[model samples]
Target: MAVKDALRFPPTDVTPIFDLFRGNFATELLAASVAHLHVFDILNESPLSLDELQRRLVLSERATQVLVTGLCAMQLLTKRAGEIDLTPLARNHLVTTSPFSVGGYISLAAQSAGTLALVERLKSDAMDREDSARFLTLSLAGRAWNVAPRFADVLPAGQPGKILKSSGRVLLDVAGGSGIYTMAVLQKYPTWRGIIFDRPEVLKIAAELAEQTGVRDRLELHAGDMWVDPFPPADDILLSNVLHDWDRPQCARLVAKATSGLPEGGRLLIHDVLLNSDLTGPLEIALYSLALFSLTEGRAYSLEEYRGWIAGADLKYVDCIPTSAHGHLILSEKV
Candidate 1:
């Protein structure tokens, strides 16, 4: 047998060599057809018979044969006994009519000479670029607050004179997007004030919400990057759905900073989806973690992981109080 055929059965841990070439070849063909021919655009409306597609695309017989064969092999299209249709992925990302279409970017990228060499950089082991800074919008922030009450309702500190209650005034919210969690707390107690710390763009919706809720005077908006900006002192330190975006070292730093900024008896609350002790249970949360992993640097960590972070900061991990959809409020306190 040929060396190429032998490697498919594999004589060593060398699947990568052939895999890389094949992957690029597929990508190159996909780019050409998607960017130039608008093949996906044609299918965006509906499926067509093989002969009908060839006539509509105006490709020569040989071109039709090669392109259709390549596309089927790439799984961009699925062929039944006679009819052909776009695959789920092609329907979603490749077609223009779909709301989830990424075809705009394919055309966008093709319009340019292309400043960067993706294959070169992909082979270089460069880290995935984070685009989260652009993903959050006022519309999202506006809607996310609707569920804030779910987490707020379970926190014992929301009531006055509780052990975790913020007896002190200023509640510093780190990267407090939309100020939902902070507003949730403020809505519970009239005695406390709040500081919403996040990006300027994010603060617009949060600040507006504070005013609309009639909590404006009681709240302050401070815009800065939480990863570098100094955190204000507070009786309660809040990190809701924040730590999961970072890796171990960075999260440890955040945990340490949050605890160190507070005095004795300060409360720390982490609101997020948690996994089982081994980080394998809860099939829903595990699947959610997979999406997060593709987008960010972290995963849905276990309670023991949170316990470790809090313990290192000299805070006691009190308990995890659950909320809707299996989300939880992880409670702790500074020693």
Candidate 2:
């Protein structure tokens, strides 16, 4: 049958084909494994014959070929003139030496037993569970807090200054891991100083990053649980990226904390990926929602929903700025 005809048949008949491209977990698993094994690393310098790659990786030839083909199919590598080499994307991003290499993220996903087990449970349960520690880690606010700094290159230029220069700005990055976002802002606008607050374990990493980036003088590290601790008072701006890992009541509590800390006319910046107003499909948001459902008690929230919470805290909604792909910068003003 023609491809279109095949797709038009009874749902059951076409389901397997759909599953092959969509539901097949093995493809991603294999690709992730190859990335972890530095398959791209071996190919970065020169094209290697399959046999040579096997030798370099100390893997059996069949196993090496299986992985190489998987990578090729995934567009991470290519075969030309009977030699295997890294694809441009792989060379730039999968090779460990590349500055933009995201190999660590893939490696973490591949190796973390907790992540893998949580994914399995989420799939099995159709993502109905809450109260999972993994859920806290994957919460909307949690992801925003963690991943926003990586895209600091794209934060609205001069925006930080626009907010800070008007007044002596005191910024708070709550549950801020690595403090990279604060560092990036400080690097851009030296006038604004901020505190990076998080649990002790994460603050250690944040402290090291602050020192390494030479923003240690400009930034202060506050180590404590955001749920119970009194955040240092700040006027002008407060940022909570991925802080909404908890349920609504907890998010309200954190918002209240931010409100208490801010002075009149201060702005609260919430950066996170938001679901559509209806909380429906935008496949990426849905996937992230599922991931959040698996890992945290909170799910991706809609902008309207966040505005409602902002109102409840007696803060006025300012604007929602789109930052990196799939994330937003939601600003609220303290009245």
Candidate 3:
């Protein structure tokens, strides 16, 4: 159960802050496409179906999808009737043979480290493992640091009437890398306990950070594979920036599995950036989706899509609360 504090939402919208943070990816993808991938050059020759373009690029399906989706979101490419073609803007400025082409200028930084890394990620869908897992999780800890407190501020710990249980509630944060969000929630509700379930390697850093958060006593760091292992039971479960790493079917399976661990009428909260219902450009989210697609098996989804999954899993839709960054908390209750 949670209470709605109308005052918790910032008076001035902080969307731009997040948009600015994500703006670098737009450049990374753009530069990679122009200088190395020659995306416009290929499109200038012929509009290609997604499959055709992917085959031509000689990149993985995930890479091609990320590149194409980002370009479409930027309006430099358009996907019409299953074919991807360059927009007039792309044709004029990105094509190599165009007199107005500025692709050369963009190519100057093509060998930059960020662009090179992005290209590598495209070629081999890199998984976060061992050292990389630690690095990636620690990096995302910065985002959690900024967003977690706001996540806690927006959720009222002991509010009545939502979940059946009112006392001794536990929060299970699935794939909760740094455990920052769980710690924040525990800080708000001293009586509540938190469990952060993640890979063993990632839990090392989470354990270290828990001591710093001052809620180590109330926090349980559980290490396991979220896909195969059983989730710990709790009054509420949180999927924070977790689902955006998996495809639709995977997301649905995870939702059902996590919901299964909850007592009847317990809450399942999804905190992530959302695309428009039509899967069209909200611009920032589409670009963010590219980031997710390039690194993982998923992309940012829509509220409508999430609602469908919630209802399918026998969970009743409750409410959505906008939190820090471009993310929102979509709350649902298991039946």
Best by lDDT: 3
Q: How close is candidate 1 to the true structure, as a TM-score?
A: 0.58
Compared with the true structure, what per-residue lDDT tens digits does model 2 show for residues 220-271?
8888777788887665444444654555677777778878767676777887
Q: How well is each residue in 1-335 modelled by candidate 3, as lDDT tens digits?
A: 24222223345555577687788788888899999888999999989998999899998665776687788889999877789899999999999999999998988879888888888888776764788888888888877777776898887553332332546578889987898888888777778888999888988988877777677888888988888898877888999998989987999999999988778768999998888765557788988887787678888888998999899899999889988888799999877
lDDT of 1 by residue, 113-140 (tens): 3212322221221322223433464544
Q: Model 2, clash count?
A: 9
Q: Candidate 1, which segments miss by more than 4 Å at Cα? A: 1-135, 139-143, 158-169
Residue 232 error for model 3, in Å? 1.8
RMSD of each: 19.6, 20.5, 5.1
The candidate scoring highest on TM-score is 3
Positional deviation of residue 230's Cα in model 3 after best superposition, in angstroms: 1.9
Q: Model 2, poorest ten-residue lDDT window?
A: 1-10
Residue 277, candidate 1: Cα error in Å is 1.1
Per-residue lDDT value at 253 in model 2: 76
lDDT of each: 0.64, 0.60, 0.82
Residue pairs that clash (backbone atoms under 3 angstroms), model 2? 134-295, 135-295, 135-296, 136-296, 141-242, 141-243, 142-242, 145-241, 145-242
